[PDB]
Amino acid sequence: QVQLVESGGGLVQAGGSLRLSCAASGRTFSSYSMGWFRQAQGKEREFVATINGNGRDTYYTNSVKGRFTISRDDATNTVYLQMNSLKPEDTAIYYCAADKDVYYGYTSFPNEYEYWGQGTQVTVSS
Amino acid sequence: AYTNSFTRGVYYPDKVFRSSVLHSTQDLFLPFFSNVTWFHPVLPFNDGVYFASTEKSNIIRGWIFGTTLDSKTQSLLIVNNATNVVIKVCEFQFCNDPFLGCTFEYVSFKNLREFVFKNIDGYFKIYSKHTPINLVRDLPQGFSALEPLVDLPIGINITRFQTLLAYYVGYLQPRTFLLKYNENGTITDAVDCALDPLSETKCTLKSFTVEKGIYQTSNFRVQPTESIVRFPNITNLCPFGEVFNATRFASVYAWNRKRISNCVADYSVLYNSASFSTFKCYGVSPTKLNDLCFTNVYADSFVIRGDEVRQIAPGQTGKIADYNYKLPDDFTGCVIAWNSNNLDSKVGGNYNYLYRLFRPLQSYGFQPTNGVGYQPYRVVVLSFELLHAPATVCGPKKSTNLVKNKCVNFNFNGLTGTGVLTESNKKFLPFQQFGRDIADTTDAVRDPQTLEILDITPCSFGGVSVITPGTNTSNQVAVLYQDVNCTEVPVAIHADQLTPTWRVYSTGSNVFQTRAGCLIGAEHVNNSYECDIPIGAGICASYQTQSIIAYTM
Amino acid sequence: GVLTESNKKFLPFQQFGRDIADTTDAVRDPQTLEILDITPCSFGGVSVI
Amino acid sequence: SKHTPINLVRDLPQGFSALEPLVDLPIGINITRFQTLL
Amino acid sequence: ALGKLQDVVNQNAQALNTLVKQLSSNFGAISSVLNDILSRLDPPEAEVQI
Structure with missing residues (x-):
């Protein structure tokens, strides 16, 4: 059983900067190349952006092209989802997940992540 | 205010005794006549620090070493009080500029105390000397070695240095010296080997006295200013x-x-x-x-x-x-x-598309x-x-630009090497790539893009010679660069990257070009004498009215 | 070698003595600081007349 | 390859003729015999 | 007629030709050019070949 734990949601309006930690325990972490997803209500599972184990590469979709940047951590074994320029519709359940280690780079199909966490929900109120 | 390192910075590099011998030894040293910094304060520790203090009554107290010394990691300390020295590697909360009124430890103007430090192979080295002086705000012109006193087998990462109460501070550099040992075993004299061409002659001959003659000491190599690469097409x-x-x-x-x-x-x-x-x-x-x-x-x-x-x-x-x-x-x-x-x-709808189902293809009729x-x-x-x-x-x-008329490192489709390129009157055949000499070496290349024939010439090189009358008589030296054009000699001997005692001869007001090379440091005369220091190609040099002259024998 | 009482003067901290050829010609005692000459043991040819 | 002007019949022409490079096609086939086509 | 001087000059030019030609011999190495040795092997084995 993998407990992928999330925290870092916020109720702040456009401009507030927040982080999305995705902590797991009982499993290999540094090697796991993991990327972030979300489940927008009124939409299906979607890809936002991704990072890799060495912080080697990034791929950003065209709705978070400048809004989201991604950076990892080494000691506490976690990756963050950096963010800026909030959108009014952006509030949703944000689900980082885990996939077996890839040689490099990213897979952007929202199903490609198999072990799914609990989620950190950001809030935008308009 | 800055001070010149007059004949100072010499310490025993090895625990060996030698009587009446010169020993050309290479290690970190403070250059002769280098620049030291005075202070009245955080400093780095690039390789070593030569420290001097000129005070009256032991006013200076101690030191703090290490990398950051914020107690967040290892930080060495040296302390002194009432003829007692307390030394430790313990981590107390170190203040910004501490003043006065655990893996190891230790316990214990009117006078000049000299301290030079370094770290090699995870050990701490101290060489010290106490000297009797009574003068103010200057570095006395004197020669004395630094004596090894303490060793700390810590291996702490040190990059930061501190002083606690003259703050003469100078850094150690990887330079070779010709030590002199007397019968008593005390270092009697030393020569920095990059102070001047005469030092070069002393280093090569292993002597503090060199007689009249031309002494070839150092080779001379031009270095590539940059590097280029070429390729067949876009x-x-x-x-x-x-x-x-x-x-x-x-x-x-x-x-x-x-x-x-x-x-x-x-x-x-x-x-x-x-x-x-x-x-x-x-x-x-x-x-x-x-x-x-x-x-x-x-x-x-x-x-x-x-x-x-x-x-x-x-x-x-x-x-x-x-x-x-x-x-x-x-x-x-x-x-x-x-x-x-x-x-x-x-x-x-795209009904024409089909996905295999009885495997037999089910139509992929996307709406x-x-x-x-x-x-x-x-x-x-x-x-x-x-x-x-x-x-x-x-x-x-990726193909770089073709830069000609310079010493560069090139890579022409894997046919690579270092040389100076010049367009040639030589004509190839439309299928030919490069030229070759009688002894089978590359001399001419064809640029893949512009299809022109270039001549490859070796980067300028040769040997340096020092012309000098006996140091028993005079201390002026004339330098001769072999088989080189006078234009490129200063930068080719790294004029900017040399002490001024070298730059005075890297360029000059007297640069003469001979068949044997380019001579700097002797104004040519038009008289003729029975030549004494032979230069070459009929040219000889001597000491006359006084300076060094170059003439045809 | 043949360790013999030396007459030369090492420095207080110096422990080794080398000649022009970088070969030890004097050694100091590790315990008592006694400085002693080192002369290689005899060797030579043997000729039959 | 080389093409040169000559006017003679029934016999091999004398004289020296260097043959410049024409094509070096990089295919990793193996060859043991060849045919010509008219 | 000036055979002796020719002999000296030839024997000095040759035997200096051979020294240049020796610069391009592997002597059992993979290549007689340092550059090929530098960018083909890690130091543990480039060292033995060089």
């Missing part, structure tokens, strides 16, 4: 667009396998795009894909759907995976797919407004081979 890339755009898309029932060979891969075109819908390469990094050579590239335009997009890949099974294209356990390849249904399908979970996306994956045939699927080759 590119003959594949038509990756043909298997990429795919408006007439492939059929999943028999997945289209395309053989690609003999091109210069446009890996950058869809690698540096950042405008691609589906990329995820497994087994080869997406960054240096543009610098690789492979034999046969197989790009498969495959049909995938909204949910089955990642199904056809290692780690996922599925209908498209099972029937049409099944990925292996260790596929070395990438996933590339344009993910949009506005183009993938037609208005009213015009079909949902994301059902949208088709042209899926392309490239697999590379290493067959018994020349690998021609290669990355594009």
